[PDB]
Design an enzyme around this catalytic site. Sequence first.
Site, PDB file in Angstrom:
ATOM      1  N   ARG A 231     -13.508 -10.094  -2.088  1.00  0.00           N
ATOM      2  CA  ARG A 231     -14.116  -8.660  -3.027  1.00  0.00           C
ATOM      3  C   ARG A 231     -14.504  -9.243  -4.500  1.00  0.00           C
ATOM      4  O   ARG A 231     -13.759  -8.865  -5.164  1.00  0.00           O
ATOM      5  CB  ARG A 231     -12.984  -7.828  -3.001  1.00  0.00           C
ATOM      6  CG  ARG A 231     -12.746  -7.513  -1.409  1.00  0.00           C
ATOM      7  CD  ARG A 231     -11.446  -6.606  -1.473  1.00  0.00           C
ATOM      8  NE  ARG A 231     -11.027  -5.972  -0.022  1.00  0.00           N
ATOM      9  CZ  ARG A 231     -10.346  -5.486   0.142  1.00  0.00           C
ATOM     10  NH1 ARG A 231      -9.156  -5.321  -0.666  1.00  0.00           N
ATOM     11  NH2 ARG A 231      -9.905  -4.811   1.471  1.00  0.00           N
TER      12      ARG A 231
ATOM     13  N   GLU B  76     -11.802   5.127   5.755  1.00  0.00           N
ATOM     14  CA  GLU B  76     -12.110   5.332   4.280  1.00  0.00           C
ATOM     15  C   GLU B  76     -13.465   5.691   4.080  1.00  0.00           C
ATOM     16  O   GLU B  76     -14.319   5.030   3.611  1.00  0.00           O
ATOM     17  CB  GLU B  76     -12.012   4.013   3.716  1.00  0.00           C
ATOM     18  CG  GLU B  76     -10.436   3.418   3.809  1.00  0.00           C
ATOM     19  CD  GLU B  76     -10.217   2.201   3.367  1.00  0.00           C
ATOM     20  OE1 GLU B  76     -11.386   1.290   3.013  1.00  0.00           O
ATOM     21  OE2 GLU B  76      -8.906   2.090   2.929  1.00  0.00           O
TER      22      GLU B  76
ATOM     23  N   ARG C 285     -16.091   2.414   6.877  1.00  0.00           N
ATOM     24  CA  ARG C 285     -15.757   1.054   7.080  1.00  0.00           C
ATOM     25  C   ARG C 285     -15.148   1.093   8.589  1.00  0.00           C
ATOM     26  O   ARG C 285     -14.050   1.592   8.899  1.00  0.00           O
ATOM     27  CB  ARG C 285     -14.357   0.793   6.360  1.00  0.00           C
ATOM     28  CG  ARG C 285     -13.786  -0.694   6.704  1.00  0.00           C
ATOM     29  CD  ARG C 285     -12.705  -0.588   5.543  1.00  0.00           C
ATOM     30  NE  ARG C 285     -11.608  -1.475   5.747  1.00  0.00           N
ATOM     31  CZ  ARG C 285     -10.789  -2.045   5.062  1.00  0.00           C
ATOM     32  NH1 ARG C 285     -10.604  -1.454   3.715  1.00  0.00           N
ATOM     33  NH2 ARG C 285      -9.973  -3.082   5.356  1.00  0.00           N
TER      34      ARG C 285
ATOM     35  N   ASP D 293       0.793  -1.187  -0.075  1.00  0.00           N
ATOM     36  CA  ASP D 293       0.243   0.091   0.016  1.00  0.00           C
ATOM     37  C   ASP D 293       1.008   1.191  -0.089  1.00  0.00           C
ATOM     38  O   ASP D 293       0.425   2.316  -0.412  1.00  0.00           O
ATOM     39  CB  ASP D 293      -1.078  -0.087   1.246  1.00  0.00           C
ATOM     40  CG  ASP D 293      -1.953  -1.245   1.048  1.00  0.00           C
ATOM     41  OD1 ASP D 293      -2.941  -1.155   0.369  1.00  0.00           O
ATOM     42  OD2 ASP D 293      -1.556  -2.216   1.914  1.00  0.00           O
TER      43      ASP D 293
ATOM     44  N   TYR E 164     -12.626  -1.749  -3.803  1.00  0.00           N
ATOM     45  CA  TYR E 164     -13.315  -0.505  -3.125  1.00  0.00           C
ATOM     46  C   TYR E 164     -14.350  -0.014  -3.858  1.00  0.00           C
ATOM     47  O   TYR E 164     -14.503  -0.145  -5.022  1.00  0.00           O
ATOM     48  CB  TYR E 164     -12.186   0.538  -3.251  1.00  0.00           C
ATOM     49  CG  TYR E 164     -11.296   0.403  -1.914  1.00  0.00           C
ATOM     50  CD1 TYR E 164     -11.507  -0.708  -1.254  1.00  0.00           C
ATOM     51  CD2 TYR E 164     -10.403   1.648  -1.416  1.00  0.00           C
ATOM     52  CE1 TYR E 164     -10.177  -0.986  -0.141  1.00  0.00           C
ATOM     53  CE2 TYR E 164      -9.520   1.257  -0.506  1.00  0.00           C
ATOM     54  CZ  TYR E 164      -9.807   0.268   0.098  1.00  0.00           C
ATOM     55  OH  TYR E 164      -8.673  -0.005   1.282  1.00  0.00           O
TER      56      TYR E 164
END
Lengths: 388, 388, 388, 388
Positions: free
Chosen positions: A290, A197, A212, A70, A324
């Site tokens: 996801r 977020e 979140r 990240d 996301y």
Amino acid sequence: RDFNNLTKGLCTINSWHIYGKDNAVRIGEDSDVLVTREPYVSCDPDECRFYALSQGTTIRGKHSNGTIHDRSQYRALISWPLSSPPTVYNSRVECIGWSSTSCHDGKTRMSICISGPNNNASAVIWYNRRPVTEINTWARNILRTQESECVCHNGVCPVVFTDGSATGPAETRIYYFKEGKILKWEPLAGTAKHIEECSCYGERAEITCTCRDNWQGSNRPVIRIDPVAMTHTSQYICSPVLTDNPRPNDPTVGKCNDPYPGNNNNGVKGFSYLDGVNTWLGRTISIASRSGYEMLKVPNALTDDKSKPTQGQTIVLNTDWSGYSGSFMDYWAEGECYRACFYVELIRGRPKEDKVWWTSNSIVSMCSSTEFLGQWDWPDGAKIEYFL
Amino acid sequence: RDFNNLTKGLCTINSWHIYGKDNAVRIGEDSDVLVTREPYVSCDPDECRFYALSQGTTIRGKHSNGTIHDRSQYRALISWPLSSPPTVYNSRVECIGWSSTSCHDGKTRMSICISGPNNNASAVIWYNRRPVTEINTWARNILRTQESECVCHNGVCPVVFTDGSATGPAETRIYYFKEGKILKWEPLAGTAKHIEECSCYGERAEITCTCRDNWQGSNRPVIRIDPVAMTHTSQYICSPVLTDNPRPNDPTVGKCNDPYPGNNNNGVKGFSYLDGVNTWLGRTISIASRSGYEMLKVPNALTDDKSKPTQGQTIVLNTDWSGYSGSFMDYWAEGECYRACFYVELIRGRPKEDKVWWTSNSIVSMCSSTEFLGQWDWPDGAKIEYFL
Amino acid sequence: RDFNNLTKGLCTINSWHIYGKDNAVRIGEDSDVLVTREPYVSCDPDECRFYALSQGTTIRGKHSNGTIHDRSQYRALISWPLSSPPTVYNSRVECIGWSSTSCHDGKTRMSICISGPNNNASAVIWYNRRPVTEINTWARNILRTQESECVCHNGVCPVVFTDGSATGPAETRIYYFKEGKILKWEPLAGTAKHIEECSCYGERAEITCTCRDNWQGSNRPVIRIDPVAMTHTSQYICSPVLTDNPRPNDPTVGKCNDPYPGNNNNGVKGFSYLDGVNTWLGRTISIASRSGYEMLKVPNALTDDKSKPTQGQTIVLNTDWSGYSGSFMDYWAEGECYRACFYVELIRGRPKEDKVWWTSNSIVSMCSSTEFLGQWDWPDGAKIEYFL
Amino acid sequence: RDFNNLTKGLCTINSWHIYGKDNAVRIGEDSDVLVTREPYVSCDPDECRFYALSQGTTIRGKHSNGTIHDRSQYRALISWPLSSPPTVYNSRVECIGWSSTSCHDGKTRMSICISGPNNNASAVIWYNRRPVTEINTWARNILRTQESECVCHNGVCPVVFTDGSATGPAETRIYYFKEGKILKWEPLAGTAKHIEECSCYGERAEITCTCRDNWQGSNRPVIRIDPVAMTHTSQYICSPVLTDNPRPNDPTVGKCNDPYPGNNNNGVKGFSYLDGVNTWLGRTISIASRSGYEMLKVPNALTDDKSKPTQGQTIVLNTDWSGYSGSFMDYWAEGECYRACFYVELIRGRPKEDKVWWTSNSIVSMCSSTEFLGQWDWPDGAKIEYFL
Ligand SMILES: *[C@@H]1O[C@H](CO)[C@@H](O[C@@H]2O[C@H](CO)[C@@H](O[C@@H]3O[C@H](CO[C@H]4O[C@H](CO)[C@@H](O)[C@H](O)[C@@H]4O)[C@@H](O)[C@H](O[C@H]4O[C@H](CO)[C@@H](O)[C@H](O)[C@@H]4O[C@H]4O[C@H](CO)[C@@H](O)[C@H](O)[C@@H]4O[C@H]4O[C@H](CO)[C@@H](O)[C@H](O)[C@@H]4O)[C@@H]3O)[C@H](O)[C@H]2NC(C)=O)[C@H](O)[C@H]1NC(C)=O
Ligand SMILES: *[C@@H]1O[C@H](CO)[C@@H](O[C@@H]2O[C@H](CO)[C@@H](O[C@@H]3O[C@H](CO[C@H]4O[C@H](CO)[C@@H](O)[C@H](O)[C@@H]4O)[C@@H](O)[C@H](O[C@H]4O[C@H](CO)[C@@H](O)[C@H](O)[C@@H]4O[C@H]4O[C@H](CO)[C@@H](O)[C@H](O)[C@@H]4O[C@H]4O[C@H](CO)[C@@H](O)[C@H](O)[C@@H]4O)[C@@H]3O)[C@H](O)[C@H]2NC(C)=O)[C@H](O)[C@H]1NC(C)=O
Ligand SMILES: *[C@@H]1O[C@H](CO)[C@@H](O[C@@H]2O[C@H](CO)[C@@H](O[C@@H]3O[C@H](CO[C@H]4O[C@H](CO)[C@@H](O)[C@H](O)[C@@H]4O)[C@@H](O)[C@H](O[C@H]4O[C@H](CO)[C@@H](O)[C@H](O)[C@@H]4O[C@H]4O[C@H](CO)[C@@H](O)[C@H](O)[C@@H]4O[C@H]4O[C@H](CO)[C@@H](O)[C@H](O)[C@@H]4O)[C@@H]3O)[C@H](O)[C@H]2NC(C)=O)[C@H](O)[C@H]1NC(C)=O
Ligand SMILES: *[C@@H]1O[C@H](CO)[C@@H](O[C@@H]2O[C@H](CO)[C@@H](O[C@@H]3O[C@H](CO[C@H]4O[C@H](CO)[C@@H](O)[C@H](O)[C@@H]4O)[C@@H](O)[C@H](O[C@H]4O[C@H](CO)[C@@H](O)[C@H](O)[C@@H]4O[C@H]4O[C@H](CO)[C@@H](O)[C@H](O)[C@@H]4O[C@H]4O[C@H](CO)[C@@H](O)[C@H](O)[C@@H]4O)[C@@H]3O)[C@H](O)[C@H]2NC(C)=O)[C@H](O)[C@H]1NC(C)=O
Ligand SMILES: *[C@@H]1O[C@H](CO)[C@@H](O)[C@H](O)[C@H]1NC(C)=O
Ligand SMILES: *[C@@H]1O[C@H](CO)[C@@H](O)[C@H](O)[C@H]1NC(C)=O
Ligand SMILES: *[C@@H]1O[C@H](CO)[C@@H](O)[C@H](O)[C@H]1NC(C)=O
Ligand SMILES: *[C@@H]1O[C@H](CO)[C@@H](O)[C@H](O)[C@H]1NC(C)=O
Ligand SMILES: *[C@@H]1O[C@H](CO)[C@@H](O)[C@H](O)[C@H]1NC(C)=O
Ligand SMILES: *[C@@H]1O[C@H](CO)[C@@H](O)[C@H](O)[C@H]1NC(C)=O
Ligand SMILES: *[C@@H]1O[C@H](CO)[C@@H](O)[C@H](O)[C@H]1NC(C)=O
Ligand SMILES: *[C@@H]1O[C@H](CO)[C@@H](O)[C@H](O)[C@H]1NC(C)=O
Ligand SMILES: [Ca+2]
Ligand SMILES: [Ca+2]
Ligand SMILES: [Ca+2]
Ligand SMILES: [Ca+2]
């Protein structure tokens, strides 16, 4: 140019139409496309653009090896024209960092990037493409922000930051910015127990963020901001339609003032539109990963702990990777109302597709229609095998 | 900026001069050129641009494998500068979809894209680069539009859509749009029995479209639109010079009010300029395939079932691939009259050139001269062997 | 914006400073650079740009095979920012063709491209980026123009065309254009016996062109144009410093009114500044090939058949390839005088470098200084071996 | 637009925040990125851009072989958007040469490039993107300038040049330019014994340059310019914190009026901000090579020969390559004070990394904060092995 005011309500959402799609990964198989993640969309009075965090390398570049990570000195907030790919040649750097937000106040754009090591991060607030304010880490544990656009009202643009643990109590703050300068800030209040977020939108002089709860909650914390009084509360979506991921199965009764349990120390950026009967929630179709994405009309989700879908739309099939998702609207469209929009990040590569050494994404984005439109599904569209 | 009005007539067409050529496939052999099809040209008051449907991949990209297919989530209406190639870096996305039209009304541009599965397609109408209106499928069988530019008159921009069978009766509608909003719509009238892919132009407050009767007709249906009264009729080009493809041999007498038979369930997008003696028709040279292209001066083709060419011009030799063709004019040029223009899509790859796995095209485009100019032929110019 | 008038004289030329260099071939070894030839430079009131004829392919593209040829359907007049390379992504197409000129009249740009087969070529005159006038071949033998910029005076922009033989009498014409329209034209007068590829500049309401006598002359024909009266004469540079290529050795006495003999049916585009003592000639250093380039100060070259250099400057060493050269000035600079400038085309590849299958060029360009500056040499700079 | 005046003082520097980073070498591993060196940053009233000297080739291009060399006909001053890489497609050429400076005076930009062989170099001064003045070599030994931005005051923009030996006395001059024209020039005065590559900034109607004494000094010469009176002096940074490289170890007492000895005939471009207690020096961390970079707060460094750091910040770790560094500020930001900024050139390839045949760099850039921000380190980020 005057500062924008949130003087309209949401349009009725009867469905969702295609707005934008970049096909970045498909195209990047054979052209100079930056590796990205944590994308979003943000509008100026005259233009809407795609935003994301560059990894400072092309997909086909050897430096894409390791882009699952990240936080590096090689990331930046970039923006580029709507539905084009984030290319080396057409991307504009907003600021340097590995966590960001950005919004236009009607006169110009504020952009915020956080950079630095885990225990010594700092936020730089850019306004009118010049750095104006800086904020040092307060908890020395990955200072971080929304990863989607902020909303402004009469010059005041609130922004939610979290500093501290991702798996326990953290310190969350609401900064109220004007022209890049801190008017004010407050520690988080209400009953949300952990905030990350936030996806924000504005209507009728109020700014709603769905966030979140990475620590305990599989329901989503909401922060309701009053940008004139510069105050806020927080709670959770009451609905038993749980919208984090991973998550347990939908119960019959949700929780309004506490995390809905069964899943710890994990989650995904998501969003909702909370507007009485005109309430739509986004979520991944899978409860475990996801993959997939659907919109569900859940009348009064915010306040009704027994509320269930009355209507729905598939955005991404459960056999396709998502990621996301967040909210934006074109506050500068003509019309009586603000048309809700959202994007979904379509993550490809690691960790799910580990035959490649990279992680990147493309974007799909949709806005609401007052019609009942037929649905399609909108996958990334790239064949991973082509990159082997 | 005022809305444009169609207050001029056509200039006399004594021949056709080169206007634009992109050489996309030649260039795309070694640079980042999007795979496209269904191109066209459209003018703004200050600029003329190339338009087409992207396939969301470069020619040399592996994702070009399969681009013979018409409809995918990876397509978009793109525009780019005149005679440049549709590159990843210079292309602007107008909207997402696999069927489109676009025009400028003198103040701003309307753009329309249709997307979705065969039985659940929807049209999104963009105006001033924001989505304004949506239209759901009415016949649940590939809602589709012109694939070339619409024309506007005092803000009113009519657009022809077809939904239903390609090989039998379908439901065609004329939408009258202003500032992205539906003023009105009507079902098709007149004697045209099947309508697809209309090529439109405007002169003297009237908008003429030449279309494709995919079901039965090898003559072309015409729709004559009155944009002030928002009414229309339809018929066929009477002339025995048949302008669809494939087609039977030219007879001696055409049909005015019925399909000219001999070829079923097939055709190609084409166009004409129907202006008394100043009447020119486009067609492929071959009767069997999309190869060659010629302009023929056929005085009174629309009304005279015995009319034959009095003059001609080769655009593309019969040993070169053609494809779709359509009409545009620069309504914002200075002068006493509108100068007729047209483009020809030069299709390369599948199904005719099947040693490559892709299908794409380049563009050539011409406008009329009041001179009698010498002709050249204008082929795509790429060697397929280079892509092996 | 008013039309520009040529109200200044030339500055004193005491030397030449570097103005622009694109390094196109060096860079094109590894990036998307169009194959070009016949380059030039032209200024707008707000910008100076590079111009050339694209071959509709990149250097590294396989379609560059065969680009020694002059005339194809794949050529266009392109323009791009000064000292950048002509890339697929940054090049703007002015018009389609294989012979061109272009100039700005103070209000907008006229651009002229000739296209078509040898016996049926036509010129299309673009003004304000729209085609306005067309001219058909008059001699049915490669209608052709200057291949460098025209000059305008109070809206009147004269342009020299030749149609007919390259190795015998041809028909040359001077077109006087205003706003794209033909005011007038005349057949060539004076004593020049053959005219090709005129390089033009303007000072004090007069436009001087130095051209190429391809048939007999190794001295250069000059055409002196009066853009107000729209009349002209022609002669040759009297000087014994011969400036065509190939050419015999410099004699002691030149010719004023006849070709200087010894070399037939060949030559190169070149230029001079003819301003009394302030007279500079360009030429290749070699008498046999297009290699080297020097400027020589030859006081009164135009009128003095015994005139010899009094000063000089090397631009390109005799061990480096040159090619076409021509004149431009920035008519819109501030100052008491017009600063003479010129470019040299640096041809690489065929026929001299035949290990590659292509022919292309880069550009160097210089303007005059009233200083006595030290010289450098300015070669293309690419290693042909890198393309093997 | 009026000429800018230096009417503010420096902001208090309590630390440095990230401003810009291009990641050029990382990205250039797989995209069309020019080889560069000697970068800098310069602001216009509406934009800040990256500047550097192109080598007229891409990194991956074969022509990058040999780019360790400083001076070739293939170099140019290029500029490109902030934090983007210097690509072939997004780079703008300011002027041609191998030594440069550039600044905006509030109305337009002056740019200066020096080109030519060692004994016959010349400077061309561009103003408003047109060449205006030229200056010939005075010492016939590599005429050279700052390699970072000049500063202007009420139209007057001083620029420091050196011509002559790099390893002995040279002739240094201060040119005072206005609108591209020489108001005045003076030979260097004060006690600085050798001047190269000055890094300049302006505050309160005074322009301070920190330079490189290549001959003897490991302390840095400073030139203080008064742009209204067009006069100057010079001295050295008194501080014992030595800021050249290579250099001896820090002594306890520096020198104010003479080179600090121990290292001859070598050095690096660097900079400082000299503002009483608000004084920060830049230097490489290593004393032997161009690796590492730190900022040190050294109160009164300019005047106090015993001054030592009271605060510091790591910019680049000692295990990472640095290179040139210089100063710029955004004179057109809003606020009471000018925010100090600087860049560091991160050199990769030869001579330190000689498994590749090239030398290039990327850029990192930082501005000051009145906060005490946590530091990160900011390396180039490319793996050389990827280029093998
Ligand atoms: C052409 O286009 C149109 C327009 O798109 C298409 O029409 C659309 O069709 C959609 C799918 O058919 C439909 O979407 C559904 O709407 C349902 C609600 O409508 C019904 O409910 C009320 C009941 O009072 C009535 O008013 C109404 O008329 C309908 O009967 C939703 O309930 C559906 O969502 C649920 O089902 C899908 C599975 O398909 C799940 O993926 C989704 O998450 C929802 O179900 C989960 O969650 C609920 C709530 O907690 C649980 O009850 C349920 O058991 C599921 O829980 C499991 O799975 C979830 C998710 O994985 C997991 O988290 C959980 O733990 C459990 O494992 C659905 O949204 C559109 O409304 C409809 N639109 C319109 C305008 O008609 C049309 O078909 C197309 N036509 C053609 C020709 O193709
Ligand atoms: C330099 O430049 C100039 C400018 O371009 C060049 O001059 C041009 O030359 C062209 C070709 O020579 C010429 O084009 C032709 O014009 C003909 C009409 O002119 C004649 O007709 C009338 C008769 O009353 C006179 O007024 C006139 O003066 C002429 O005599 C057209 O009839 C030609 O079109 C037909 O022929 C071509 C074959 O070449 C076909 O491809 C075309 O489709 C037409 O023929 C088909 O269709 C007709 C009508 O139904 C049928 O009668 C015919 O049998 C054909 O049908 C078969 O083929 C078709 C198509 O494949 C198929 O569908 C069908 O079923 C059948 O199989 C042609 O258009 C230009 O007019 C002329 N222009 C000018 C200004 O002069 C000049 O040559 C160049 N010079 C040099 C030195 O090169
Ligand atoms: C730093 O920078 C400065 C600035 O650049 C450098 O100084 C420059 O140096 C140049 C070269 O040394 C010099 O250029 C020459 O100028 C000569 C004229 O000056 C002399 O003549 C008059 C005489 O009355 C005096 O006033 C004056 O003071 C000088 O004495 C030119 O004559 C030179 O051109 C001729 O020579 C070169 C060969 O070097 C040829 O290439 C060129 O074509 C000319 O010669 C041909 O043509 C003539 C005329 O027809 C014939 O007479 C002659 O025989 C040649 O003919 C053959 O070759 C040609 C061409 O290939 C062919 O066509 C023909 O058929 C025959 O085969 C030359 O231009 C600059 O003037 C000077 N500038 C200044 C301001 O000083 C300086 O050196 C640099 N310093 C350092 C340290 O490097
Ligand atoms: C989160 O973020 C914050 C913000 O960045 C971090 O806090 C910063 O931490 C920095 C490093 O710890 C610190 O930087 C140092 O500041 C020192 C000065 O402060 C001290 O001095 C005075 C004394 O009166 C006190 O006021 C003060 O409170 C402190 O005690 C500097 O002195 C340091 O610089 C020197 O050390 C480094 C080595 O680390 C050298 O690289 C540097 O060049 C300096 O030392 C050389 O030069 C001096 C002067 O000539 C010599 O005395 C010395 O011997 C060295 O000489 C050798 O090496 C050099 C260079 O290679 C060579 O040329 C020479 O010949 C010799 O070989 C250093 O700059 C920041 O001030 C501090 N900032 C703040 C606001 O606190 C924090 O740690 C982070 N937190 C976490 C959790 O990580
Ligand atoms: C928003 O309201 C404020 C507060 O009164 C006002 O000053 C401003 O001009 C308004 N902005 C717009 C765009 O109407
Ligand atoms: C990427 O890096 C890993 C180690 O970090 C290495 O094992 C692997 O070889 C690299 N992948 C490729 C395909 O180069
Ligand atoms: C077109 O005519 C309408 C209707 O009267 C008028 O209002 C409009 O201004 C006209 N447009 C132009 C460009 O002349
Ligand atoms: C393209 O796809 C087909 C199957 O859809 C496959 O057989 C073929 O191998 C592919 N073509 C190439 C050259 O990869
Ligand atoms: C040039 O002179 C003409 C003729 O009188 C005049 O009308 C025009 O405005 C002049 N142009 C400029 C730029 O001065
Ligand atoms: C280019 O074309 C020629 C024939 O026109 C052919 O012989 C040659 O093989 C080609 N050159 C290359 C390197 O492909
Ligand atoms: C700077 O001061 C000068 C000298 O008086 C003045 O004329 C100029 O307008 C000033 N510039 C600005 C931007 O205030
Ligand atoms: C670069 O050039 C040198 C000689 O200048 C040569 O020895 C070497 O082979 C070249 N390097 C590469 C990798 O081509
Ligand atoms: Ca969670
Ligand atoms: Ca048909
Ligand atoms: Ca000749
Ligand atoms: Ca030194």
